[PDB]
Design a protein around this ligand. Structure first.
Ligand SMILES: CC1(C)CCN(Cc2ccc(C(=O)NC[C@]3(O)CCCN(c4cc(NCc5ccccc5)ncn4)C3)cc2)CC1
Lengths: 244, 201
């Protein structure tokens, strides 16, 4: 009946009781279309973002917020000052991991600052099926136990899945976001120039350029990278057959 | 005081100063996002929400571009957004039931004004899993979380419907059936402000 009452009674979050065609030919097309993974170790605070070319169709931004650590983080002061509009294509999309606190507001300020409008709010809902006992340490301003995170999707320029990702809450000190966000993004078929800022060795993925301070190796070459999108491949969605 | 109370009215024109102060305000506005009863963005900004509370919480349901407009109103009215509840909408078998993604949830902003003392913060979590009822019917679970958060206190709901009336709550909306007031302080101030029982612009 009342899963909220049940959570109060037992510590099992309401999301613990949610139960769960061929979208795989599309996934196969995405895979054939993907560029080789490319990646660059870079200290984004000291890095001139403009050296990342060409302009991107999709930017996934995952700055390491302090709230992710209950065991160098980026403040929204730092994040807001990134020059994301300088590397986004005039028609492009952004997916910004905002956490669960003040980022839900300041992430919207960032989106508007960089020229986007928010078009979706994707919620990563965390179950606790394996640790009903472990209570949560509350942020001082919090009214409720925070059991989710938000990834905001923004669009700039002119112009399937659900806006929910449900997984078990990761082990403490694990900051990784669900890989399912990549699936949602790639299924939109938004183009092939895809940047993941503050990615890690563990998130490197075909079809993506990954830029972050903790990468152990680099293979990025701006001229090589641009060559993946030169004619006749300039406007492929990443969901169509490669051009003969 | 304690049993359900309500006022059929146009919330744009009611003098809400007669209602006193509330520990919790909840609103489910007819935002102008694409309808009868819709309020324009300016009408929502101008609602006299600030007189309703000194220290307490506001629960503001939002969808589409009111995700942003509701945040504007929340701040204009004097609140800081400190939480965001999402209701995951299910069918009777607990399966999940914006032109880029299908929508599995509704959002409710949680704002704070002043420094509320004696609330039971952290008893519930910020995800509701509950069955969809009629069109635009919010889940009754929210009243339980609000009661555990602030037991026994005075609460006010804006843009509610008859099925929303609850003990400890005063409900306002233009599809309610007449006026039903039991709190003597509110009855007194209502009769003085509205001696003929009519609420006009
Ligand atoms: C799923 C959700 C959690 C719940 C639904 N929500 C959206 C939502 C949809 C419908 C209602 C609803 O049915 N609410 C009862 C009403 O009566 C309806 C009519 C206007 N309304 C007013 C309006 C008003 N003045 C304005 C006005 C303008 C023109 C003419 C007359 C009056 N004054 C008092 N009540 C209030 C509420 C919310 C999404 C998420």
């Amino acid at each position: 009946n009342d899963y909220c009452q049940h959570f109060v009674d037992t510590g099992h979050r309401p999301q613990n009781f949610i139960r769960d065609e061929l979208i795989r030919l599309k996934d196969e097309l995405i895979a054939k279309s993907n560029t080789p993974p490319m990646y660059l170790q870079a200290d984004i605070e000291a890095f001139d973002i403009r050296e990342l070319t060409p302009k991107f169709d999709v930017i996934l931004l995952e700055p390491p917020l302090e709230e992710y650590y209950r065991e160098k983080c980026w403040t929204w002061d730092d994040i807001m000052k990134l020059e994301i509009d300088e590397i986004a294509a005039p028609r492009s999309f952004i997916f910004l991991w905002c956490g669960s606190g003040e980022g839900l507001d300041l992430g919207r300020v960032c989106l508007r600052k960089w020229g986007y409008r928010r078009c979706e709010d994707i919620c990563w809902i965390k179950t606790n099926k394996n640790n009903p006992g472990k209570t949560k340490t509350l942020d001082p301003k919090a009214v409720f136990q925070r059991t989710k995170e938000h990834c905001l999707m923004g669009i700039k320029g002119t112009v399937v899945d659900i806006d929910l990702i449900i997984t078990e809450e990761p082990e403490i000190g694990n900051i990784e976001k669900p890989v399912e966000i990549f699936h949602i993004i790639e299924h939109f078929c938004l183009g092939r120039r895809r940047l993941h800022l503050f990615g890690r060795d563990s998130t490197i993925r075909p079809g993506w350029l990954t830029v972050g301070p903790t990468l152990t190796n680099s293979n990025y070459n701006a001229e090589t990278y641009a060559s993946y999108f030169s004619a006749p491949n300039s406007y492929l969605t990443g969901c169509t057959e490669e051009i003969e | 005081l304690f049993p359900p109370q309500w006022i059929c009215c146009d919330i744009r024109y009611l003098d809400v100063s007669i209602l006193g102060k509330f520990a919790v305000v909840m609103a489910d506005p007819p935002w102008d996002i694409h309808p009868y009863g819709t309020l324009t963005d300016d009408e929502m900004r101008r609602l006299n929400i600030p007189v309703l509370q000194d220290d307490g919480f506001l629960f503001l349901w939002v969808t589409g571009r009111a995700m942003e407009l509701g945040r504007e109103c929340l701040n204009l009215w004097g609140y800081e957004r400190v939480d965001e509840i999402i209701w995951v909408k299910t069918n009777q078998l607990q399966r999940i039931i914006g032109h880029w993604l299908n929508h599995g949830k509704e959002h409710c902003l949680v704002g704070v004004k002043g420094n509320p003392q004696g609330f039971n913060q952290g008893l519930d979590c910020d995800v509701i899993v509950a069955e969809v009822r009629s069109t635009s019917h919010k889940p009754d679970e929210i009243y339980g979380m609000i009661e555990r958060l602030s037991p026994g206190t005075r609460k006010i709901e804006l843009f509610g419907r008859p099925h929303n009336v609850q003990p400890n709550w005063i409900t306002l909306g233009n599809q309610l059936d007449g006026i039903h007031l039991l709190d003597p302080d509110v009855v007194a101030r209502f009769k003085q402000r509205y001696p003929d029982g009519i609420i006009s612009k």
